Amino acid sequence: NIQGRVYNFLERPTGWKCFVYHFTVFLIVLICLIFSVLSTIQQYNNLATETLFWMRIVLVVFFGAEYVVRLWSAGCRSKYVGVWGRLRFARKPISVIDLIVVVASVIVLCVAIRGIEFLQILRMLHVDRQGGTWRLLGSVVFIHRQELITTLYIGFLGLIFSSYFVYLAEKDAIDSSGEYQFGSYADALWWGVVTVTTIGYGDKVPQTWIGKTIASCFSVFAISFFALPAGILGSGFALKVQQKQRQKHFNRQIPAAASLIQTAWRCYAAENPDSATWKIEHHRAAIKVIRRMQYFVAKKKFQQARKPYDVRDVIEQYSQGHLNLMVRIKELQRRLDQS
């Protein structure tokens, strides 16, 4: 249908055909920013006023039209069909930004506000529509919560305890220009946070040899505790890249998928006494238990059916094959033993 095609163009992009449109809005709003700066520089007044107003109203009108068109076209998915259900789509966190940008542009055109003109850049800045990037980053951050937490905690403790001692050592030391640069603990904490992240502006440096010794013994050990989170996440991404290439083909999931729904519906229909499923008193009870076992087995199999290959499959496969061969070996031995 044409509605689905429109939805697949505004959202869920395919490539160049939507890319040109994205690029054009991208550059036109940057032109808007440069033109607002030019009007601030107070160039030829007539142009810098009238054409700025023209292209501002053009931009806000286009933005509202795109928003309403996308809101209508979002009805292709069953989750958002209907008037009362579309409020859920309007509640999506990404879509709120577009409304905020539209209302901010409307208010600006009607009229710090000078910074509010920059707030409109919010929409263009967020260009990833399906949320793939944030969705990818969130899982990796969530998996490694404990080691990030512990290293941040250790770094914080080291920072505080080291920054206190240098303040103690450097309390009464004057500078060349005659100004106490370590007069209070607030200055020492600022020095600690500038130094533990290897920035080192140079506005505050220790001057007494005691403070120099403490800083030298501190920084070398404490820098790694803050450099750790980058390495942890980098290796986490790199390892998952390997798993992304050793996935099972789509052809191995269809049978288990069909079996799961079939056995689930059979379990559901077992609740009624007159459904045709009885065509296959006491047996009517055992049948339910057997069906429940089958449903659990099917669920486990489906869960296994969409995971990358693992040695556990080899270990279970060997035992299954060994039993399958063994039963026939004993059956043949017993059959031959009759004579």
Binding site: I254, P255, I261, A276
Partner: protein, 137 residues
């Protein structure tokens, strides 16, 4: 409350208090299912927790008390339905559903498929909203 034992004794022919794989196989012969040895072994494992390979009665009530209605299962059923969606919008053609459920996996009888389909397709033509079919089960 604990009436399940009445069914348990049905599975416990020898009366030792536990269900073995041979007992399951021999009771399921009476219904004409004709199972496989590996299938019986796999079926048994999904209940046993002691690791001894034999079903205990407390584990039996533990399994029977497990409720189907829960997010962990509804999500899996929804994913299994989604696997078969050609576009992901949440609609399936009725003929494709009938063909799939008749030929793939373990084949259902025609009358079961008709009964299942009659509960659906009330919306209109041969589009079936599986996201409301799921809540029915």
């Amino acid at each position: 409350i604990a009436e399940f034992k009445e069914a348990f004794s049905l599975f416990d022919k020898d009366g030792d208090g536990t269900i073995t794989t041979k007992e399951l196989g021999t009771v399921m012969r009476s219904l004409g299912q004709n199972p496989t040895e590996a299938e019986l072994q796999d079926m048994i494992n999904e209940v046993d927790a002691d690791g001894n390979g034999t079903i205990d009665f407390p584990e039996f009530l533990t399994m029977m008390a497990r409720k189907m209605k829960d997010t962990d299962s509804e999500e899996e059923i929804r994913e299994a339905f989604r696997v078969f969606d050609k576009d992901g919008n949440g609609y399936i053609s009725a003929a494709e559903l009938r063909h799939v459920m008749t030929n793939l996996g373990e084949k259902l009888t025609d009358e079961e498929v008709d009964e299942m389909i009659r509960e659906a397709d009330i919306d209109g033509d041969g589009q079936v909203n599986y996201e409301e079919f799921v809540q029915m089960m």
